[PDB]
């Protein structure tokens, strides 16, 4: 029935958009459910961001099944326009993937976002 | 020769010494430690008196380069430069003989 769970609140959404902004600054970001599915195959994916205003929505339902197979966190965001904007990118991106790097300059922000997401998934 | 752009601030009319004191700012990107001679030339063309009616000194530059701040002087006449200036600056500018003793 809901099909839009979990959907994030306000300050977590802008927090995620800022983390995606520095992630696009550090080329540690994947753009597209095609690419995101490939990163879920290679096991390099930290977590997955999906949009809620994508028409249709059922093209994006494969990512929770593949993530729950791989035990990977995921949270919906309401805008695909702002989700495109946080990529340093001027046309919308429906879904983005966070890649794995322990040498990442922004790693603590990624662990805090995974703390909020993994808090919300339970 | 990189568009020197000599900037002046702190201009106060001082008629009792017949002068106008002001802080010379020398921006110099891609140019290092220009002169004392060219400075007296290029600030006398906004006051339009003469080169030897212009005194200047000071100038400890910014660290790294690209900015220089000194202290500049302009008078109303040539004879005022011979009376109101120090005796060694006129030798430095060339306007006098240093009687060595």
């Amino acid at each position: 029935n809901p099909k839009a769970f979990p959907l994030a609140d306000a300050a977590l959404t802008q927090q995620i958009l800022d983390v995606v902004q520095q992630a696009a600054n550090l080329r540690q970001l994947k753009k597209g459910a095609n690419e995101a599915t490939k990163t879920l195959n290679r096991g390099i994916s930290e977590f997955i961001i999906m949009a809620a205003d994508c028409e249709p929505i059922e093209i994006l339902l494969h990512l929770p099944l593949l993530c729950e197979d791989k035990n990977v966190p995921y949270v919906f965001v309401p805008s695909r326009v702002a989700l495109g904007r946080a990529c340093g990118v001027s046309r919308p991106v429906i879904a983005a993937s966070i890649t794995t790097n322990d040498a990442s300059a922004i790693k603590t922000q990624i662990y805090a976002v995974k703390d909020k997401i993994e808090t919300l998934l339970i | 020769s990189d568009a020197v752009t000599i900037r002046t601030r702190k201009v106060i009319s001082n008629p009792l010494l017949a002068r106008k004191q002001f802080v010379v700012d020398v921006l110099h990107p891609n140019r290092a430690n220009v002169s004392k001679d060219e400075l007296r030339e290029k600030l006398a063309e906004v006051y339009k008196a003469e080169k030897d009616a212009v005194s200047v000194f000071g100038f400890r530059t910014q660290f790294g380069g690209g900015k220089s701040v000194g202290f500049g002087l302009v008078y109303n006449s040539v004879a005022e430069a011979k009376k109101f200036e120090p005796t060694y600056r006129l030798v430095r500018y060339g306007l006098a003989e240093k009687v060595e003793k």
Binding site: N25, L26, R27, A103, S104, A105, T108, A112 | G64
Partner: protein
């Protein structure tokens, strides 16, 4: 600075080089002096855990000490309860060094390649060229760390060894 209490002790001696292996240092003097400053803070850190709650000493000399740790870029703001201050450790001051932040921000492909790039009149953070590896970035200066206007990899000159390589081509192949 201050020397540690025991100079040769097995689990600590190998713990030196795993710090020297990741960060790429040259002297345990540059390790011990970092612990020395962490020593002096931590004694003061335990002083304000004894006194009364909402002491203005615990406020003025506490929170400014807390905010300065946020200001240097070490204490994350979520742990801003003066109880993570005891849970600080050695690598976090090592992590805020100017050498290691170059490698994290692409651009260095090593921690040892970035060490050479500090001492060769390259990368500046503000408009000041920094050539000391321990410059301790203040977290408001991260996305200003960049190649210089001069000193190529930044352009407008290719440099004395690239110009000499250009010089060799003109004299034998050309004239």
């Amino acid at each position: 600075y201050s020397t540690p209490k025991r100079p040769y002790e097995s689990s600590r001696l190998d713990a030196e080089l795993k710090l020297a292996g990741e960060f790429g240092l040259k002297n345990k003097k540059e390790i011990y002096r970092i612990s020395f400053q962490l020593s002096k803070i931590r004694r003061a850190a335990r002083d304000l855990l004894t006194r009364d709650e909402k002491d203005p000493k615990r406020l003025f000399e506490g929170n400014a000490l807390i905010r300065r740790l946020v200001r240097v870029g070490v204490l994350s703001e979520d742990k801003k309860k003066l109880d993570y201050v005891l849970a600080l450790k050695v690598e976090d001051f090592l992590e805020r060094r100017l050498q290691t932040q170059v490698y994290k921000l692409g651009l260095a492909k090593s921690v040892h390649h970035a060490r050479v790039l500090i001492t060769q009149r390259h990368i500046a953070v503000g408009k000041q060229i920094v050539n000391i590896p321990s410059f301790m970035v203040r977290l408001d200066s991260e996305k200003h760390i960049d190649f210089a206007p001069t000193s190529p990899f930044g352009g407008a000159r290719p440099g004395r060894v690239a110009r000499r390589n250009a010089a060799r081509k003109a004299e034998a192949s050309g004239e």
